[PDB]
Each structure stands twice: as structure tokens, then as C-alpha cells.
């Protein structure tokens, strides 16, 4: 298939587009990170309604002590909750 070819195109075009809306051309900040997820991954990744999730994940996801998140850190932890949460589905209801 040609699905994966498009997959990489979607991830990076949106990553650098909003990541440089007010911060740096290609570095994320706590404020760029939460807006990027509430934008298209709604109901999948949460940050606005769960405040504990933002400070605990973002501050510790910058495990290097960078109040800014790199693209590599964002894809690993955010993609974990992406496939993990989907598996539970409503079946966990």
C-alpha cells in the first residue's frame, strides 16, 4: 500500500506547521504541545481537561529538563497512548 508514505507526510507537515506558530521554527513548548493535540487528536490524546496529565507528562516527558519537547520525545510517548487507548476501546466500559 501507499498508506505509510502518506503517514509520514501527515505527521511532519502538521508537526512543524503549528510548532512554529508562536515558539521557535521547530521546537515545542508546553503551550505548543497541548494545542497541537487538542487540534486533531481529540478524544485520543488529552491535555486540556486533564491538568495533572499535562504537568506530569510534559515536565517529565522533557526528561532532559527542557521545558521544550523535541519531535523524537513527542512521537514516542504520544503514540503510546494513541494505540494503547484505542485497544481498550469501549469494551472497558
Amino acid at each position: 500500500g501507499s498508506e505509510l508514505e502518506t503517514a509520514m507526510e501527515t505527521l511532519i507537515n502538521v508537526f512543524h506547521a503549528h510548532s512554529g506558530k508562536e515558539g521557535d521554527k521547530y521546537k515545542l513548548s508546553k503551550k505548543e504541545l497541548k494545542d497541537l493535540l487538542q487540534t486533531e487528536l481529540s478524544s485520543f490524546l488529552d491535555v486540556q481537561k486533564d491538568a495533572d496529565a499535562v504537568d506530569k507528562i510534559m515536565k517529565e516527558l522533557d526528561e532532559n529538563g527542557d521545558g521544550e519537547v523535541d519531535f523524537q520525545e513527542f512521537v514516542v510517548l504520544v503514540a503510546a497512548l494513541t494505540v494503547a487507548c484505542n485497544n481498550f476501546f469501549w469494551e472497558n466500559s
Binding site: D52, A53, K56, L81
Partner: peptide
């Protein structure tokens, strides 16, 4: 990482 992972999924 795994230890705190339980908190997010448990607390969610």
C-alpha cells in the same frame, strides 16, 4: 517511566 505510566492510565 513504567511506574509513572500506571498513574496516567490509572488516574487518566
Amino acid at each position: 517511566k513504567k511506574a509513572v505510566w500506571h498513574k496516567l492510565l490509572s488516574k487518566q
